[PDB]
Design a protein around this ligand. Sequence first.
Ligand SMILES: CCCCCCCCCCCCC/C=C/[C@H](O)[C@H](N)CO
Lengths: 57, 57, 57, 238, 238, 238, 276, 251
Amino acid sequence: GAQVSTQKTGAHIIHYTNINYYKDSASNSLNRQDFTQDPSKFTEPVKDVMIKTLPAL
Amino acid sequence: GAQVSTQKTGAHIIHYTNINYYKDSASNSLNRQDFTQDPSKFTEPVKDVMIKTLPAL
Amino acid sequence: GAQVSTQKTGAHIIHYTNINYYKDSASNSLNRQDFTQDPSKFTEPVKDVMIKTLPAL
Amino acid sequence: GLPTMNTPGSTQFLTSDDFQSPSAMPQFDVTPEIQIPGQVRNLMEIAEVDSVVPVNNTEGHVNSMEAYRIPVRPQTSSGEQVFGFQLQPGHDSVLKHTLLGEILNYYANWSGSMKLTFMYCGAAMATGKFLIAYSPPGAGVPGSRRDAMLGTHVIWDVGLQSSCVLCVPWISQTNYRYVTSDAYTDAGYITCWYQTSIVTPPDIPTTSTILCFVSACNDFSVRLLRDTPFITQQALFQ
Amino acid sequence: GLPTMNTPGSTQFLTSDDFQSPSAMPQFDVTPEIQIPGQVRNLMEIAEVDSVVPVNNTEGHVNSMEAYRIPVRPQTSSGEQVFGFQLQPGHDSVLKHTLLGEILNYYANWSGSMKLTFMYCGAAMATGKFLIAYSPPGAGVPGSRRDAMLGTHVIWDVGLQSSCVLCVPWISQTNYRYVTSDAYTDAGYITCWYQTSIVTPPDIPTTSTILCFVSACNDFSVRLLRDTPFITQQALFQ
Amino acid sequence: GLPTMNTPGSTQFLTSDDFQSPSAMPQFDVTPEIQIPGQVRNLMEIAEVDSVVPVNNTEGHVNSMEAYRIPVRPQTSSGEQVFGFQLQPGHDSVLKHTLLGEILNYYANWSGSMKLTFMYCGAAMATGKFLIAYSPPGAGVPGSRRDAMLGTHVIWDVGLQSSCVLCVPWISQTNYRYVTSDAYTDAGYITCWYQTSIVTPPDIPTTSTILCFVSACNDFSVRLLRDTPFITQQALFQ
Amino acid sequence: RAVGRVADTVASGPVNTEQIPALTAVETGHTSQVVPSDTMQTRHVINYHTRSESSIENFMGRAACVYIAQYATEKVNDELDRYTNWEITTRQVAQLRRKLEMFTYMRFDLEITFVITSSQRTSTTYASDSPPLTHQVMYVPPGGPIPKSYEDFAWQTSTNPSVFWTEGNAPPRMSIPFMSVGNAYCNFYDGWSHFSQSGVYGYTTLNNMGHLYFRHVNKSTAYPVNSVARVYFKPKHVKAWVPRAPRLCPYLKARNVNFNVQGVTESRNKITLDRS
Amino acid sequence: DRVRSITLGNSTITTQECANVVVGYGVWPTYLSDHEATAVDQPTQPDVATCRFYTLESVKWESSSAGWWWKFPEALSDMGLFGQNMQYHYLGRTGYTIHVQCNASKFHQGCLLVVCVPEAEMGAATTDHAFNHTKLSNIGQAMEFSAKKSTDQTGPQTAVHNAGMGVAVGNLTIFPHQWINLRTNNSATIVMPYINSVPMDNMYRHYNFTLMVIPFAKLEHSPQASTYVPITVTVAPMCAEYNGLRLAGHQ
Ligand SMILES: CCCCCCCCCCCCC/C=C/[C@H](O)[C@H](N)CO
């Protein structure tokens, strides 16, 4: 039940092991490595699509 | 002798590992995840079956 | 995710195990066993090659 | 040795822990268990059993069997009220020492539907109809039988089957209500009214008796264990 | 037992740790999550939304809606300046309480391009051209419209589309600038100038209004979390 | 828990340890490295570069460029000595502030062959021969050119190639010598003598100049890191 | 390209087009998606930057002090009593409160860590010899029997979760799951507690998290000792919805959002820049 | 394009200069799912007698106008059978189509922000004092901001640059918004979904969202033009459903 995952490294021996010790999922560590996002709920929440090159009106 | 089991999580990385260290079963941890039940010993302990829709007498 | 590597021994049971515990690569230990080198950037940084046996001028 | 490091929380006693510990009696031969009848694997098996409710608990009546006896009688006009209480199954004085109410006071959250059973304990020659109503908590208490006919209700015809069940549904905006009451998680009111009357032949006593039973339905659940505010002690019992 | 040895750092509280710890409520049944709209998974979704900039913040104007209203009018000669501020999106007084500026004050490093949007809020019969310029920080402030035409700039023609976007590019020697400003990571200046004038027909007010909006581009990133120097307290709030 | 036991050495700070430790900045995005020229992966790349030796360091000459200028001149008789120093590349005053000598003072043991390069900086019309000799440390210092011709030596003919290399071989009974000198690991002597003379045409200055360079060979190695006895401080630099 | 990595910019040349990416309309509610490649000539840059530090888990996952609890081994008054309590809230400190109030609804698990420290009270003498102090931090769920004094029966903690800690060791730490009776923790509640629109206005009616009682389980000391326990909340497994505007004004109370009126930003003397 | 027609029930909105439609957080309103419900009784869904357009009273826009706010669903407490269903039910749930409309001329100038703020919890004008609910919102009356601070002993803090919430008024553009710029824009329509942390709620003790209308560029014109411009708000509920039938409330 060991989860070997990728460590946070830079860009131009890179793995860590995790064992879960407790029977509750609230006892687990933080989910540091989850970087998913979609900003279209806030920046472009209009009904008809608005292409950049075309005039807005 | 590792027992990988399912952690307690909610509803809409979820496993834990356990090693037993001692030679007595009374040394073990609690059985937290056993939710079996049958309440018909107390709520309906009559000899003849009683269907809900039918009259009781 | 165990990396078994060669221990530093002399010349005339020689291995160690490493587990990474943390999610950041800056949390790792030192890279002690990296002895690569190339001194030609400093000792012989000339454009035309200079053979030892031949005259330099 | 193996290089280790100690996290926060070392050398503590958290009383709701789950850790292994060595045995003081090693290789102790425990006696074999047998089939004893009535095994309990859950406190929700206990809470799903009927338990008679002291609706008549206006003291001095709590120090006798008069607390369980809801009185009814023949009426001069119809539509009067028989009884009424708030639906607080862990906080209201009518329901908090019942068998469902005592389990809920070990917990802080409750959820699910409930069953109020009623039992007419009058003479077999006496007839009657009743309206038992549940009101969601928004408008206030119902003031009449006209106010009570607008919510969840049932009309009970007293006949050969002496009992009727008003099922109190779970109509809430949260998934859990609190056992100790507050205004955010208020659950409403239970009232009972004369639908018609009690009509008897001659040579029969006037006042009859209705018994109210509470139990939990099969979607009932509890949460967040706590200490009950019912037992106290100032010193160790010697 | 297993032979162990304790490294430096045992029995410490590092507040940015990541360790497991036992539960005080074991087997607690957490309520199911539902679809709530507007979920945020990153603070860069918040910073990429337009937020109107108080360019007119010369007090007393900050205590009213006059702080957001950049005034323009018909001119006697052309090429005069409308406004100007330093491009310090976490330190300059014009940009540090905007919605992009408030996220950056939780961080110490920022990187990426920005979008300055402008919005002409005058009458539909009034026309105009404007030059909005960005200057890299080497030479100093531009002194005229001739000095500003040498850097990154855009000429905006006020017409049926009321808005124009000046895109401020990331022209830096480092991959990150600092949020609290210094001279090593200076980012430059933003100025606006009259390209032509405001020309109106009769029976129209003289002064018009331009609104400036800031947001981040899709290559924007922040780094090195810190406390913000904006909220303070001398005691616990009771 | 898992039964453990603590060995000697727990809760200590050994400054040359190698242990993991948690991060104060979790998930910090480090900037990408680029190709910078001149990367150093070993201090033996630095020590294998020539560095001019102050052989003429008789004060007052160390406070000027006269320390590097070994003087030669036409002679009245041949076989006289030009210079001489002990081969202690980390302890002798001639070699311990050179670029090879400064790396060795961080270490306690050194091993390998060395290269002494010489450079005649006189006029192109002046000729000359020289004998540069290395003596193993058993007999003492050579007293003449006859005493020096018995050890490892080279005769250098000054011509179109201005430089000659005396290679000092590793002739030792141990695999390592000590950087701070002692009598058990003595390495010997370096001397230079007039093989013939300096012969010049007329209208040429008498005294010429020879520059001595030191570097390490490709079998050179160092061992046992230490603090250098060259930098000191009595208080913290404010 | 990996998840969380920013976009590259593409090489763009000169244009003379009928396309107008610079001209837009703010009136539509739309934030324009203009890249620097659209309004000027750019080069091809391979951007390797990541949005790691800006995640909701990374922005929130640092422990912040939420309460300072004081109690002594000898009562002065009921503020420096033998025991003390704290209604669990996140609004008494300003640093964590401003970070949580950037969202309307959140849903997280907690880590509570205590930094308990003692100090000898000012006296005419201090020369004593005392055994190490041990503390109890009992959690009482909403509606349970609270300690009415020291030596109380309610500290028997048969069903309440307790922790015990002797001074000198590592700080105590436990994990708390998501505890709301709804589907999210409400940072804001625009409403009342009673149906007649009266009673308590605000988020106070949606915060029934219970109390946290502190004491010394040692019976006595030779000379009185004052303790201070700092409570540290670190949220983990964080979800968040409906991002709020950041707060301008400082806080005044813990149960309100009441403020004093302040300007929108700091000032300057003129709207232009005047050098060369 | 600039034309748009919105039909809900027996009511139609036509607009000849429309900017666009802002849809919430990208979510269209819908009925509650079976895997998200809590109450067990059958809901009632009056599809056309409630999900129709209800127009409010106009407000006069002046040069010295600071702004107005409406709190919902309490703004429609008496609007037909939407108001009759609130009184008879404990729980309710709905999304909205807010349509704000204001035309002036090609010779006027001004700009209005139209934000929909979920849980716009307002502070008190006089602090250390709880305020009355009729100062927060009357039944359909437009509660209005002020240019300077309020010293009302039982009212909200109506200074408009702090927006009643202690925040900067310029940062309200993360909430679902449009702008009515009189140069180009005639109306502004926002479709809001149901935003709450619970699947249904009581529609009297809780203001789910607040509609604010704020002049950022103030109204100015020639004195010989029309000196009266009104601002009308037309709101349609969407997918409204109810639970917990009892007597008429609402105490
Ligand atoms: C002595 C053992 C102590 C055990 C500690 C248990 C206390 C924690 C239980 C309640 C947790 C409440 C978490 C608080 C969340 C915030 O109030 C929300 N952000 C606002 O609703």
